[PDB]
Amino acid sequence: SNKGAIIGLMVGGVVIATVTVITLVMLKKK
């Protein structure tokens, strides 16, 4: 359908993956 369609999920796929790492550290402040 579109080879570029995935190129847009690059920037949106890294951010959501970064916040997940920080979240784990948040609760670690226990």
The CA-to-CA distance between both ends of the chain, in Å, stands at 47
Q: Which two tokens stand for residue 5?
A: 């369609």
> ∠ at Cα 16 (6, 10), nearest 5°?
20
Ranges of each domain in the chain: 1-30
Distance in angstroms (rounded) separating the CA atoms of residues 15 and 28: 20
Q: Which two tokens stand for residue 22?
A: 């920080």
- Residue listed under structure tokens 């402040």: 29
**Which token pair is 13?**
């796929």
> How big is the chain by its Cα radius of gyration, in Å?
14
**Residues 1-25: b if buried by 16+ CB within 10 A, e if exposed:** eeeeeeeeeeeeeeeeeeeeeeeee
Q: How far is CA 15 from CA 2, 12, 19, 21, in A?
A: 22, 6, 6, 10
> By three-state DSSP, how is residue 2 classified?
coil
Experimental technique used?
Answer: NMR
- At CA 7, angle to CA 11 and CA 22, rounded to 5? 20
